[PDB]
Design a protein around this ligand. Structure first.
Ligand SMILES: O=P(O)(O)OC[C@H]1O[C@H](OP(=O)(O)OP(=O)(O)O)[C@H](O)[C@@H]1O
Ligand SMILES: O=P(O)(O)OC[C@H]1O[C@H](OP(=O)(O)OP(=O)(O)O)[C@H](O)[C@@H]1O
Ligand SMILES: [Hg+2]
Ligand SMILES: [Hg+2]
Ligand SMILES: [Mn+2]
Ligand SMILES: [Mn+2]
Ligand SMILES: [Mn+2]
Ligand SMILES: [Mn+2]
Lengths: 328, 330
């Protein structure tokens, strides 16, 4: 029992990485009451979560998470906090398939909201695949999907309070920092510009090799309808800069061009897209995100990266990868 | 749905008395989930509850309080937030019967918290905690005193006890108890567990429209003390004045906090018996004399030395215990 930590929080005092690790270890184990878990989440919220706190929390959740045979070769994650406000299509999910077809190995983590992960079901992709096969799919197809629920069983002890609270808390940012395959590289999108730098520093503490945290025009990704604020981690060194669609040799578009629809529609969108028959704005936003991710693998010419991602798309070869995966 | 108010709280913004009233008017009817109530309580805790918010919340609780036929003559309450970690004898309860024995009408409101409490004492004396409002009002008319037990008049005060004990930390609820007397008295001697709550609580009382009141804290006790100076905030004719009083201001010897200490409920019951009968410890009598003395100030009696002297003669007289038995006889 950690009463001692809670009073520290109630005094607008931040926890140490270890104190936060304890608190969140007890949380995913259901050791806390609804009221306590809520007081913890709200006290941290009002004060403003610190990088060491976010790292300690994530560090805890991963410890509880189910095992995954982590490979040696380089692979990464392309995931975002979501809830950006601007109803858009599933950029990250599409980018994972295009990236896997553009050289990179992507092990994506994430769970159903409509929304995301639901259209993966629609493509006939068993969300509860075994850690054994996902590792296999990753080696053979350069991509796999790790559904949070089966890896973070304890995450359910926090859902009720989160829902009833209907407000943003540290759990919104801990979603992307807990891939059970512990990837060394990652493209992480955040719903707010103020989150870009904090997360970056969190990933550093978590010891990530190469990573990028993005936000632009309200999107928790790389934007085509406006500049994207970036915080890149490399060699334990962080750099801040901003990118525009012309930096990928792409033409700036409009957010509206990237607007979601419904289960059936969106399935068609991503299908007819990965098949190389979608809109131009859709192909652009994706290639832009894949282009920045490829920079985490050492490919520094964003324009060439974008051109390749775009041709890989138009190739249709990506969709043949949701099918190869849908058979296991 | 009060989601708009909860989102405002999470941004370190204060609610208006109206908003506060709405939010707590929902809390007492068990309409909020444990998570939401706890979030609401912690967010106000961390920021610091304002006078206007304390009033809104109290107004809400009083709205759902069972009725009580409020007399037109002057009467008062004498209660504190408790929880001062002092372990002293029951000052306010004793001061309640002594004040009545010399002419002051006292309709004391008592909260629950545990035996080990003022109501547990009166219960030990044989007093009916579930006496009807009519009977407590009839006792106030003839005996100058009566006890209004919280659980009997504030049925919604319970929908918060589970969360309150789980959180194991102070919240706005610790200070609402003393402000929700169901008879809505025009005068009151309220004690608080910390010096910084004196002014805010007196400011809330004014907002709630109290005529004459005094909020105090003295060397750790939520009562007027004689072992050290007492922090006071007095409301009179619509204005609040701040000052401290000292034992000497009452003409009383200054005894230690330790000499006021109590024990088991049984010790506490007999201690209060001997005291009220005019056979207790000097420390005990003196500490009560000081609280009754300030109380009478709310009744236009401005000389504290005289007030304290009257309280002492009232105590050695033994009538205060007489009124105890009489209250029990009903
Ligand atoms: O609150 P909402 O607006 O519904 O968004 C929240 C979701 O968005 C993110 O998807 P991810 O980062 O995996 O990107 P995707 O859209 O490409 O799946 C995240 O994984 C959530 O599932
Ligand atoms: O149990 P605690 O942690 O101390 O907190 C609650 C206390 O508040 C009440 O005091 P009251 O106003 O009735 O005055 P009295 O106790 O001096 O009679 C009650 O009698 C308890 O003493
Ligand atoms: Hg490529
Ligand atoms: Hg009197
Ligand atoms: Mn995304
Ligand atoms: Mn997104
Ligand atoms: Mn008291
Ligand atoms: Mn007391």
């Amino acid at each position: 029992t950690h009463q001692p930590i809670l009073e520290k929080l109630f005094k607008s005092q931040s926890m140490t990485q270890e104190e936060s690790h304890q608190l969140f270890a007890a949380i995913v184990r259901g050791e806390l009451e609804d009221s306590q878990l809520a007081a913890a989440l709200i006290s941290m919220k009002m004060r403003g979560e610190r990088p060491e706190e976010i790292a300690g929390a994530a560090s805890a959740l991963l410890a509880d998470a189910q095992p995954f045979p982590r490979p040696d070769y380089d692979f990464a994650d392309i995931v975002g906090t979501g809830g950006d406000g601007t109803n858009s299509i599933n950029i990250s999910t599409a980018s994972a398939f295009v990236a896997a077809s553009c050289g990179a190995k992507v092990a994506k983590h994430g769970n159903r909201s409509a929304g995301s992960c639901d259209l993966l079901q629609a493509f006939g992709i068993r969300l509860d695949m075994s850690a054994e096969d996902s590792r296999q799919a990753l080696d053979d197809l350069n991509v796999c999907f790790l559904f949070a629920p089966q890896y973070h069983t304890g995450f359910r002890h926090a859902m009720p309070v989160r829902q009833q609270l209907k407000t943003r808390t540290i759990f919104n940012v801990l979603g992307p920092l807990i891939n059970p395959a512990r990837p060394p590289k990652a493209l992480i999108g955040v719903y707010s510009p103020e989150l870009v730098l904090p997360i970056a520093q969190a990933l550093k503490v978590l010891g990530y090799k190469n990573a990028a945290v993005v936000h632009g025009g309200g999107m928790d990704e790389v934007a085509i309808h406006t500049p994207t604020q970036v915080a890149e981690l490399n060699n334990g060194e962080i750099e801040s800069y901003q990118l525009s669609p012309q930096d990928f040799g792409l033409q700036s578009y409009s957010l509206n061009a990237l607007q979601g629809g419904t289960p059936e529609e969106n399935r068609d969108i991503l299908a007819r897209l990965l098949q190389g028959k979608g809109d131009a704005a859709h192909a652009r936003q994706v290639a832009a995100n894949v282009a920045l991710l490829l920079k985490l693998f050492g490919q520094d010419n964003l324009r060439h990266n974008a051109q390749l991602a775009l041709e890989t798309i138009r190739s249709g070869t990506a969709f043949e990868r949701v099918t190869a995966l849908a058979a296991r």
